[PDB]
């Protein structure tokens, strides 16, 4: 066997978030970064990353070995194909209701609460002033994915560990981008940075991360 953290019986005692789509693993490429709560306590037990395609593949092993019992139904293929901030934003709040219903569900075969749980005893993340992962678009005008770093009163982005870019908050000014109209950009929890000009066009993964982010930046 591999050694797993929670048993299978046990499935009910915990809480699944979904954190992050945009999340770098091992080998550096996106994934969705997952943390396995305990109810009575609420504390994080510990994260795990798994990549869309891990996903899709423990998604597949159910269907095939429990083909009468209802589950859920993962985000669309589309959703992971050009980046958007509305697509990021979706995607997420569909894993957390995929998730939440997978260890929900009262009994599995052996076979099957096994391997879920392998899943998760597995790709295990370790992680211990204002960061996370942004999406960031210039004024052709796609979405990249950098992770952003608060220091003091500057702000530094980075691609894969490697400063892209770094802006100065006493010289910019911010200002929120409503959701609504959806834009020709997909848009949402988005704000604009414009630096003195040159503005930076800034969304995060949910709506909540951008209150966090502008509170930051105050």
Not at 139 to 151: A, H, M, Q
């Amino acid at each position: 066997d591999i050694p797993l953290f929670v048993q299978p019986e046990d499935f009910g005692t915990i809480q699944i978030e979904v954190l992050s789509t945009l999340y770098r693993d091992n080998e550096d490429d996106l994934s969705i970064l997952i943390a396995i709560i305990d109810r009575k306590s609420g504390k994080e037990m510990f994260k795990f990353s798994k990549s869309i395609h891990k996903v899709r593949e423990l998604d597949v092993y159910m269907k095939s070995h429990v083909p009468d019992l209802p589950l859920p139904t993962l985000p669309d293929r589309q959703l992971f194909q050009t980046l958007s901030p509305t697509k990021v934003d979706t995607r997420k709040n569909i894993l957390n209701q995929y998730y939440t219903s997978i260890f929900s569900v009262p009994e599995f075969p052996k076979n099957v609460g096994l391997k879920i749980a392998q899943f998760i005893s597995t790709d295990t993340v370790m992680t211990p002033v204002k960061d996370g992962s942004l999406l960031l678009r210039r004024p052709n005008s796609t979405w990249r994915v950098r992770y952003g770093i608060l220091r003091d009163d500057v702000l530094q982005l980075f691609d894969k560990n490697q400063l892209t870019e770094t802006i100065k908050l006493r010289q910019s000014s911010i200002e929120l981008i409503p959701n609504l109209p959806e834009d020709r950009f997909g848009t949402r929890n988005g704000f604009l940075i414009t630096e003195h000009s040159t503005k930076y066009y800034i969304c995060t993964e949910t709506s909540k991360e951008r209150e966090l982010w502008l509170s930051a930046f105050s």
